[PDB]
Amino acid sequence: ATVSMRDMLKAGVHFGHQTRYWNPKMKPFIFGARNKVHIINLEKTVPMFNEALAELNKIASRKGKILFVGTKRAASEAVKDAALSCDQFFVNHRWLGGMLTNWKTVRQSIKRLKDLETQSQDGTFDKLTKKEALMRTRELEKLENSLGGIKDMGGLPDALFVIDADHEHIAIKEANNLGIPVFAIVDTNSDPDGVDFVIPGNDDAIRAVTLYLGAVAATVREGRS
RNA sequence: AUGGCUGUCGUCAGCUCGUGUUGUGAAAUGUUGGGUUAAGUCCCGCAACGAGCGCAACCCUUAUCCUUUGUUGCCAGCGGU
Numbered sequence: 001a002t003v004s005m006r007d008m009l010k011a012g013v014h015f016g017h018q019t020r021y022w023n024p025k026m027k028p029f030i031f032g033a034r035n036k037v038h039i040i041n042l043e044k045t046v047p048m049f050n051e052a053l054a055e056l057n058k059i060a061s062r063k064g065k066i067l068f069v070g071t072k073r074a075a076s077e078a079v080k081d082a083a084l085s086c087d088q089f090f091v092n093h094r095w096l097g098g099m100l101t102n103w104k105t106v107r108q109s110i111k112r113l114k115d116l117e118t119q120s121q122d123g124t125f126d127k128l129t130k131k132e133a134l135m136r137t138r139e140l141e142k143l144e145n146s147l148g149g150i151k152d153m154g155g156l157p158d159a160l161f162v163i164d165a166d167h168e169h170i171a172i173k174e175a176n177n178l179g180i181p182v183f184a185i186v187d188t189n190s191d192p193d194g195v196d197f198v199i200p201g202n203d204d205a206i207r208a209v210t211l212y213l214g215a216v217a218a219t220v221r222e223g224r225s
Numbered sequence: 226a227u228g229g230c231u232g233u234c235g236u237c238a239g240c241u242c243g244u245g246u247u248g249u250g251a252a253a254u255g256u257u258g259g260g261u262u263a264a265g266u267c268c269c270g271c272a273a274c275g276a277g278c279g280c281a282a283c284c285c286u287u288a289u290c291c292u293u294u295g296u297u298g299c300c301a302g303c304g305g306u
Contacts, residue, residue: 097272102245105274112275138268170272173246 001218002050003211005042011207014040016188023166023191029200030188038188040200052183052197053219056159059181060223064158067150068213069171071095075163075209082213083149086220089157090149099147100174103156106147113143113151159183161216163203166190185212 014031016022016038022030031041060066068090070079076092083090091099099106116136119125125133144151160175162168162184172194175182184195185203192198202208 094271096274098245098274100245102272102274105244109275173272177245 001215001222002053003046003215005046008042008201008208008211011211012205013045013201013208013211014042015202015205016040021189023189025191025193026186026188026200029198040188040202042200045200048197049199052199053215055181055197056183056216057219057222059158060220062158063224065089065153065156066159066161066216066220067091067157068161068163068216069095069168070163070209071168072164074206075203078206078209079163079213080149082217085214085217086224088220089153091147092149093145095168095171096146097170097174099150100156100178100180109143109147110151113140113147116140116143156180161213162195163209164190165192165195169194185209 018037019033022038029041029044031039033039056066066088068079068083068088070076070090070092071094079090079092096106116139120137120140125136128136156178157180159181160171160183162171162182165172165184165186166189169190172182172184176194181197182195183197183199184192185199185201186192186195187201187203201212203212
C-alpha cells in the first residue's frame with residue numbers, strides 16, 4: 001500500500017509556508033516559488049516517502065511499537081482515529097518533556113491513572129465525599145487527555161511518527177537520545193537534520209494529514225498480519 | 226567544645242528533593258508566565274514530570290438543634306406554704 005502522485009496534489013501537499021519562514025537546510029526539497037510562498041518538489045517526496053514506508057512495514061511485522069505525535073488542533077483529531085485503526089499508540093494533545101527520556105517517571109504516572117480508572121467503575125465516588133469525588137474526577141480528564149493514548153505502551157516504542165519537526169522539536173530531541181528511528185513529515189520551515197527518514201510536505205490542511213497516517217495505518221495492518 | 230529546651234525573622238509563605246533537560250561550569254529548569262487566593266491556594270499554559278517539609282484539613286473551645294441521663298441540678302402543668 002502506497003500513495004499516488006496526483007491524489008496528494010489535490011490535497012495541496014506542495015503548498016508550503018511563506019519564504020519569510022523557510023529553513024535553508026531544505027533547498028533540495030524546494031521546487032520554486034508562487035505568490036511569495038514556497039512550493040515543495042513532490043517528485044522527491046514520493047520516493048522518500050516510500051523508503052520510509054518500506055522501513056516502517058519492516059518493524060510492524062516484527063511487532064514493534066510506533067508513536068504518532070501531533071499537538072495542533074488542525075490535525076489533533078485525525079491522528080486519534082488513525083491510531084484507532086492500526087491500534088497503536090499516540091499523543092494528540094500535549095507532548096510532555098519526558099515521555100521517552102524520563103519514562104521512569106511517567107510510568108508511575110501511569111499507575112495513577114489505571115487504579116483511578118478502575119475505581120471509577122466499582123462505584124468508589126458514591127462512597128467518597130463529593131469534593132474528593134470532584135477531585136478524583138477532574139484529574140481523570142486531565143490525565144486521560146495527556147497520556148491516555150499511551151496508557152498501554154508497556155515500555156518504549158521501537159519507532160515514532162512526527163508531524164512538523166518545527167513545532168514539535170521537543171519530541172525529536174528526545175527520540176534521538178534513546179536510539180529510536182524517526183519518521184517525520186517536515187514542513188518547509190523546519191530543520192530536518194534531526195530526522196532519519198525525512199518527508200517533505202504540508203500538514204496545515206486537514207485533507208493533507210489524512211493521506212499520511214491513513215497510509216501509515218495501512219502498513220501497520222500489513223505488519224500485524 | 227555540646228545535648229536537651231527557648232526566643233527570633235514569622236504564623237511570614239515560602240524551602241527542597243528524585244528523574245529528565247539546558248550550560249565547559251558555578252547552576253538553571255520545575256518554583257517562571259495569565260488570572261486568583263489569607264496562601265508556590267487552585268485552574269490553564271509551559272522542558273518539564275512527579276514528590277516531600279510546610280499551607281489548608283484532621284484537634285480543643287465557642288455559636289444552633291436533636292437523642293440519652295436527671296443527683297446535691299432545674300420549676301412549667303397541679304397541691305400544702
